[PDB]
Amino acid sequence: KKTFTEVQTERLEQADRSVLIKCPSKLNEKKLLQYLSSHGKIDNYFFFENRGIHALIEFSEKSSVASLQAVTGIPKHVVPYKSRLFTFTLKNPGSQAAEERPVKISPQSHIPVNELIPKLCHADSISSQMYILLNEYQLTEENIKLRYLACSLVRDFARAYFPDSTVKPFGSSVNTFGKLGCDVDMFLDFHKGPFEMEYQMKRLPSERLATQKILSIIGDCLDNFGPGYSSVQKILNARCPLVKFSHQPTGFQCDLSVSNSIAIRCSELLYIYGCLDPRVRALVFSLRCWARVHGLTNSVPGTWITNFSLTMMIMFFLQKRSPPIIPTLDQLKELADEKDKHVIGGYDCSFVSDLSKIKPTKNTETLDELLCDFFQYFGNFDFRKNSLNLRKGKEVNKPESSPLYIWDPFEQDLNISKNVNQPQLEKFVAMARESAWILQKEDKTQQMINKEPWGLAAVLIPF
Amino acid sequence: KKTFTEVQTERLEQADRSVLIKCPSKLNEKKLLQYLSSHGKIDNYFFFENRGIHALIEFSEKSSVASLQAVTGIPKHVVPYKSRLFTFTLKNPGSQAAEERPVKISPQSHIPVNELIPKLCHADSISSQMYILLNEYQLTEENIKLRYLACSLVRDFARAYFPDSTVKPFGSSVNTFGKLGCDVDMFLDFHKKGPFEMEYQMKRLPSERLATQKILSIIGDCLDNFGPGYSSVQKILNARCPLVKFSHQPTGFQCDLSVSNSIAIRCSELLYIYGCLDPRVRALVFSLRCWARVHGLTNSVPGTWITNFSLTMMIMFFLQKRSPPIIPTLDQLKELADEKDKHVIGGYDCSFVSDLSKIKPTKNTETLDELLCDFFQYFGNFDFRKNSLNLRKGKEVNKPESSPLYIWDPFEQDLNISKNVNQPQLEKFVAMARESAWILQKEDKTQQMINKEPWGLAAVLIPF
Ligand SMILES: Nc1ncnc2c1ncn2[C@@H]1O[C@H](COP(=O)(O)OP(=O)(O)OP(O)(O)=S)[C@@H](O)[C@H]1O
Ligand SMILES: Nc1ncnc2c1ncn2[C@@H]1O[C@H](COP(=O)(O)OP(=O)(O)OP(O)(O)=S)[C@@H](O)[C@H]1O
Ligand SMILES: [Mg+2]
Ligand SMILES: [Mg+2]
Incomplete structure (x- = not known):
């Protein structure tokens, strides 16, 4: 069975080598994938509707992104920041040489309450009602890849000066309780001769102030360099410094904080209970x-x-x-090896990761x-x-x-x-x-x- | 004589494979170069005095920088941005008093006026006075390499967000009229099989002026908060030419960073011609x-x-x-310009001969x-x-x-x-x-x- 931390790492690695392509008006699926495949193998892909047809493409190799970026150009007044967001049009609009099929749209939002009610009434038991709701509301495989991609795009900004950084989603997005349309909570995470040789590097201030400055800048980058980001809101003075923003390509509302690895542990906890x-x-x-x-x-x-x-x-x-x-948290704590031991800010946050080890x-x-x-x-x-x-x-x-x-x-x-x-x-x-x-x-x-x-x-x- | 554009390209390529090493207190020159040479051949090097002893090392191959960066670590807090600035200390500091020659310091500033006056009085003609001044004030080969290195470092820094960027010096630094202690004027410059025109999503802004302003504002803040050696960062984004001023402590230059003003370059090349003539x-x-x-x-x-x-x-x-x-007049140079020396920028003609041999002495x-x-x-x-x-x-x-x-x-x-x-x-x-x-x-x-x-x-x- 897949452990929370294994799943995060995998999902991130996948989103790492994924891109978003605003598709042509009259779209040919096969020709597009045939073309994109020339740059490398495609493990997964899908299409969704967000003010026009967008497609998520997940390659097998990260080099395929580089390859694809090579042949991509700038629209010749813009900020020349090159990310993984593309616009595909036809070289010869009058060279359309196949039948037009319609593409499947992966839904990215749930049906509203008023429509859900009928479907519940027409079920057998209350048990089944709740499961209808669950299926209508829960995250889809597609929506998830799209959430991790949002994080992945935000990561690329931060790594400009913190190369080992990651942007990790936490909260309802990753703890199995996520529903369609819920916000993406993100936190930025950071971790011979006769001469002692060291780089010169700028020192940072204390935890809280470093956080504030890092987010302020990253916020501004999202606002000014980043395509798609709007309503960027710096809330740096909260108990947990935070930047809120809307990301139009994926359509998610997002919350970016710094380095709260406690909240992750609780997100893993809830993941276990959800999976049990x-x-x-x-x-x-x-x-x-x-x-x-x-x-x-x-x-x-x-x-x-x-x-x-x-x-x-x-x-x-x-x-x-x-x-x-x-089981109780302590009961999980009792089953935790020293490999599942974590102590953060003085607080014990230790508990089993392996799901098989828990008594059903x-x-x-x-x-x-x-x-x-x-x-x-x-x-x-x-x-x-x-x-x-x-x-x-x-x-x-x-x-x-x-x-x-x-x-x-x-x-x-x-x-x-x-x-x-x-x-x-x-x-x-x-x-x-x-x-x-x-x-x-x-x-x-x-x-x-x-x-x-x-x-x-x-x-x-x-x- | 080489053409302005040939010289820029060469100087930049050299600075590309150069590094700066804050040297030990008690320094041994030979042991240091011997050690550094292990990572590759060294075409040039020199030492200067800027709040302690620094050395510029120019390798023959760019791979030598990578090699050297491999064995270099982070000071165990900091921003882990890895550039070409190093600090070299002794593993066993109290196991040696190996003072160097002591090492020759390449001067990076000119003698002041009060000291210059005597030397002028002691000359033969006024002609010779002016040439004494010229030699005492003009950029040295070392100072120049240090100027291009500053640009080269800011380039890498900018390249964090804009991988295809370049940073090119203009003004007195490169037009032959540069004197020791003058500021480094830099501008940031930006430079299909299958059935698809494939292009990036990018925000469509009104003028190129606003893009410039935002790019510099961010890069300024990055220099201020993440960049090593940068201090006194001043955003002057609303000027006729949006600008960021900053002090770069490693080289000790005051710097001016603008965006994409390729007109000013043409005038810097113009003045270079007149200076070289x-x-x-x-x-x-x-x-x-x-x-x-x-x-x-x-x-x-x-x-x-x-x-x-x-x-x-x-x-x-x-x-x-x-x-x-x-x-000659600018028009006279314009008359000698081929279509390869033709340049039209923002509507303005900035065409003139590049080749110096073509001009009538x-x-x-x-x-x-x-x-x-x-x-x-x-x-x-x-x-x-x-x-x-x-x-x-x-x-x-x-x-x-x-x-x-x-x-x-x-x-x-x-x-x-x-x-x-x-x-x-x-x-x-x-x-x-x-x-x-x-x-x-x-x-x-x-x-x-x-x-x-x-x-x-x-x-x-x-x-x-
Ligand atoms: N008072 C709190 N105490 C401990 N952890 C908190 C607290 N508030 C928020 N968190 C953590 O931050 C995560 C995200 O916060 P929220 O978005 O507000 O809640 P959520 O679990 O993501 O569910 P949603 O977003 O309302 S559907 C939570 O899941 C917690 O891990
Ligand atoms: N008022 C101006 N009008 C037109 N071009 C200008 C003007 N000011 C500066 N420039 C251009 O920007 C370049 C650098 O500007 P400055 O640093 O102010 O002058 P400089 O040539 O570097 O000589 P210094 O630094 O005063 S010794 C100039 O060489 C011009 O190409
Ligand atoms: Mg949430
Ligand atoms: Mg100048």
Whole structure:
């Protein structure tokens, strides 16, 4: 089985030797690939629709990019920054010499709620509803390659002066809980004679200020040299210095931070839980959707619960099952060799990487029960006295006054849901309580017969 | 003699395979070159003094740089940008007192005025004074290699984002009129089987002016934050020519980085021709540049003052007007230019002969004694209010615009290169020329030598 870190390395290596080609108006697929193949073998490719037809081409060898860049020219007022974004037109527009087939468009966004509801209503069980949702919403192989490519393009800027750099995606994009249309969270990562011979190199300041200057410049580069980047927003003074930007070629909204290797460990953690049992993913997607539908989450930050916080609450829920659906963080820590040992900023972030080594769950609860039980469980959870600990998998006394306390499983000084206020917590608790009520006391078979919402769909519409 | 463009290409190729090594405190020359030679043959090298001992090493093969970079490490924080700047220390510092010869230091600056004056007084003719000055002030072979290396390093740096880039020096650094301690003017220059026209996505901007501004702004910041040796980085992006100024500590040069101004190069080649044509040309410019500085007619900061470039062009016009001319007019060079020497840039014709052998050598035989005094006499009595200087025609013509001092930009015509100059400064110039000419005419040379006093060039190179 593929370990998180193996998958990152592979995906990055693939995106490394990938390019984006704005295709001709009247397009011939075969002639294009035949032509491109002349520069080297093509492992994968696909087409998508983003203000015209674009194609992602993944070569087998990185040299194929160089080869292809050789024959590529500048449109003779531009900034001559040469990246892996191409525009292909015909030399002789009047030499079209084959039948026109239509190309398959890989979708890059999910169907909206209003269209999803019908499909859910026409399913058999609530279990199947959640799996329909999961399939309609989850990242596709294509979308993923496109996410890693975005990172790969941003990497190329940074390497100008930090040659060993990488830009690594973290968060929902890579932890199996990613849905179509979600943002790409990126962080920039940096790691004889009679003479001692050293390069002269400019010293940097302390961590935080170096970060700020590096991002400020890279931001400006994206804004001024980089094709496709718009709405570049420097938020350098946050707790984690950050640059936000929109990347039009791939259509992703993006977040670029520096060197937070703790967040990665948690992204790997969530990846494990996501990979362990398909019910885990199914449940997160439906409940993330639920939260959005009732206005418990928001696109902008504030007093609301966040998807990440909500996700962690769901992980705690699954830890508490009889028997558990997923092990505690400590239980993974207990199975970690010294090769899986990582200590970062003083904090232990050690846990098993190999998935085979984990004892598969004996739990057999259906998603029907788990969904309603989630609403029941947190609807009757004493938030004022108890806090969520994912290391121990137990309710414990709150170390601090905060309406909703969830123990940051790595930087254990912290409350990840610290932002949440009492009002929003209560609106969450009331929605859970109403939600659980609806599922318990609804007459399923009659709703189907009446052409009405039931199960998942019933709770995925405003009250 | 080689052609401007041939010389640039060669100098750049040499600087391409050159490096800088901050040397040990107690240095052994032989052991160092012996060691460095292991990585490949060394065509040239020398040492200079810039806050400690540095050495320039020019290998015969570019691979020697790669070889040497292989064994070089990072100082164990820093920006890991690997360039051609090295620091060499001793593994066992207290196991040797092997001081070198001590090593010869190639000077990189000229002696000051106060020391130069004696040497001038001690010469025979005014002609010889000017040539002493010329030799004391002009660029040395070493300083030149160091200038091209600066450009070569900035090139590599720029090439981080723009792999096909080149950085070319222009101005006094390469037009034969360069003196020790003058700034390095650089400009950044940019240089199908199958059924497809394949082209990059790039942002379409309004003018080429804006691209320039953004490219320099970023490169400036990169020099400031990531680049080794660069300090005092100043973005002057809104000038007539967008510019970044910076100090480069390894070579100790103050530098000016602009983008893609291939007109200025043509004028740098023009001045190179005039400089190469006759040694009196260079001699006269150096002495008169020095003269101007001494009397406060020029300044280090820009403003109402005449500039060295403007002053240089005035001297070129003077030499055009001789009987017979010491140098041909720009048009006369334009007339001798083949279609290979034809260049049209931004609409402007900048065509003129490159080959120096093709130009008719001057029949003029005036001595520098006469020319110097005649310069002061000529411009002291020049009607600046009516007449303007045209170096294409080599003639006084009516001023196209109200401006105290008008000199026709020989390429971008309908520009006045001395536009900045106001009436007061022009007059202070005219008065200094008039006094200067008077002193040379009515001075009793032999008596001044006998009296242990300044004479000729030295007489006019001290405040009045
Ligand atoms: N308070 C926090 N405490 C610990 N880690 C955090 C916190 N906030 C964000 N992170 C980490 O940063 C990653 C990305 O942040 P978010 O984009 O806000 O959330 P997300 O997991 O990516 O899900 P989305 O983007 O809302 S669908 C999270 O997955 C965490 O690894
Ligand atoms: N007012 C100007 N008008 C036209 N061209 C100019 C002007 N100023 C500078 N240039 C051009 O830029 C080149 C370099 O500018 P400068 O560094 O200011 O002068 P310079 O020739 O290097 O002599 P120095 O540095 O004063 S000794 C000049 O040789 C011109 O080609
Ligand atoms: Mg995210
Ligand atoms: Mg200069």
